[PDB]
Amino acid sequence: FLWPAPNEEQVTCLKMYFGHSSFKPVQWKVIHSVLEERRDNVAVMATGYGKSLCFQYPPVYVGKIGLVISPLISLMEDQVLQLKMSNIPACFLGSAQSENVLTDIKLGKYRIVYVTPEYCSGNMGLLQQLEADIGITLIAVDEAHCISERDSFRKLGSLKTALPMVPIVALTATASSSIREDIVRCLNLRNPQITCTGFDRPNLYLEVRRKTGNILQDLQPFLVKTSSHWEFEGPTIIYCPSRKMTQQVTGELRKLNLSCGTYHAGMSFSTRKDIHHRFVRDEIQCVIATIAFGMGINKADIRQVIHYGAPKDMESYYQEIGRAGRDGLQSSCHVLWAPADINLNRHLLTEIRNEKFRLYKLKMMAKMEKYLHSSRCRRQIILSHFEDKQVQKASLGIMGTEKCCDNCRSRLDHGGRLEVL
Ligand SMILES: Nc1ncnc2c1ncn2[C@@H]1O[C@H](COP(=O)(O)OP(=O)(O)OP(=O)(O)O)[C@@H](O)[C@H]1O
Ligand SMILES: [Mg+2]
Ligand SMILES: [Zn+2]
Numbered sequence: 001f002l003w004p005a006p007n008e009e010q011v012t013c014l015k016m017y018f019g020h021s022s023f024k025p026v027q028w029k030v031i032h033s034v035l036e037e038r039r040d041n042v043a044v045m046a047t048g049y050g051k052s053l054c055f056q057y058p059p060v061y062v063g064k065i066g067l068v069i070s071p072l073i074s075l076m077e078d079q080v081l082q083l084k085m086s087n088i089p090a091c092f093l094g095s096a097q098s099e100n101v102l103t104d105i106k107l108g109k110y111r112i113v114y115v116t117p118e119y120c121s122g123n124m125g126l127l128q129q130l131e132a133d134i135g136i137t138l139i140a141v142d143e144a145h146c147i148s149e150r151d152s153f154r155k156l157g158s159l160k161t162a163l164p165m166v167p168i169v170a171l172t173a174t175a176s177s178s179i180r181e182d183i184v185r186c187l188n189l190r191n192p193q194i195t196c197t198g199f200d201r202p203n204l205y206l207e208v209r210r211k212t213g214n215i216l217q218d219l220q221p222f223l224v225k226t227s228s229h230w231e232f233e234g235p236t237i238i239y240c241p242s243r244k245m246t247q248q249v250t251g252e253l254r255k256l257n258l259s260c261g262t263y264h265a266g267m268s269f270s271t272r273k274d275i276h277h278r279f280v281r282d283e284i285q286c287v288i289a290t291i292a293f294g295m296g297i298n299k300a301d302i303r304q305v306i307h308y309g310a311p312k313d314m315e316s317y318y319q320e321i322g323r324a325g326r327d328g329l330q331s332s333c334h335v336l337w338a339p340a341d342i343n344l345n346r347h348l349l350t351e352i353r354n355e356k357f358r359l360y361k362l363k364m365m366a367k368m369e370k371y372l373h374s375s376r377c378r379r380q381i382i383l384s385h386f387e388d389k390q391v392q393k394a395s396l397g398i399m400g401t402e403k404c405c406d407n408c409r410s411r412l413d414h415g416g417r418l419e420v421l
């Protein structure tokens, strides 16, 4: 019912190591449950809120081990670097690691340890020694970037068996009751605290447009012209359905001599740290990406997001656009789509085998098409999917305004009802 305010020493720790002056509410609710109440958590946090602080902060505060489990190996490398820049010792642990590195974890060097779901199953005795010798503040089972996953996730029911005293934070991307029930049974969570941040990003304007037949003609509205050169109005990410289309979009932007970078799924640590530096320093105006996570696209002042093609589904779409406007200033997210787009092609779906995943692909395909075809508020459609209920239109202060979405804006441009309270 009531959450106590963080004490002085807790706020000071958050300032020294994470560079924040105060907690956001759901962050504190999750942190306080884990740190002070030792309670299992299922935390529904939309992207951009600060998921990663909820499991990084407690172990740093008490100087103990925090165990983070995630299937995305490159993302965990990116976080370990970010933590090292913040003076926080962290490592990514696997069988490929030296026996020497395992020594430092036993001795307690690393506040935050990253492992894959597979590694965690085969080294349970190692964890209990870490519990006995050093002490574990929490176990973070992310699975909020889960795509096409398995046995790996059902082998984690042993954590509460081997480590009954260690709280578990389960981060998730939807408020779905079905997902929450599955997570609770899989992890054997005990009366878990449930939180939800909500999913709105009021500073993102949502537009959908049809393609015109040529890449340059589609991108022309998004370019401004200095008397010498063409440029985007601001830092821009362009999401493509494939690396072939990324190279096509890249080729057209060279014709205008635009600072561009590509961001794909097999890039090395150096390549990802190079894109990050160039993107944040504005040395490249635009990133054309085939993935929706990692260092390279982690920038605070991305002004424009363009989907050059229909997105695969709402979950990917929400994550992709959530990289924009992280500074809280105005941003725009445009989809450029055609009915023949790859992520809207049903006929390709026949060739792949698995049934009821083709049906899931079918349902996501049809849901995505309904969104792109909608004449109603696009913000309402997205929030209703992630809240798993019917979000009432114009309850939030942004919906129904010229800043909300192209359908609201055009309706207000044609004698719409600017709603007074
Ligand atoms: N309490 C806070 N006060 C101010 N800024 C914060 C706070 N917590 C987090 N942030 C900042 O908000 C931004 C979003 O946080 P973060 O980078 O952890 O995203 P995320 O939700 O974990 O994303 P993803 O889904 O990609 O993992 C970052 O710039 C982070 O430093
Ligand atoms: Mg994160
Ligand atoms: Zn309490």
Ligand SMILES: [Zn+2]
Residues within 6 Å of the ligand: 376, 377, 378, 379, 380, 399, 400, 401, 404, 405, 406, 407, 408
């Ligand atoms: Zn709207």
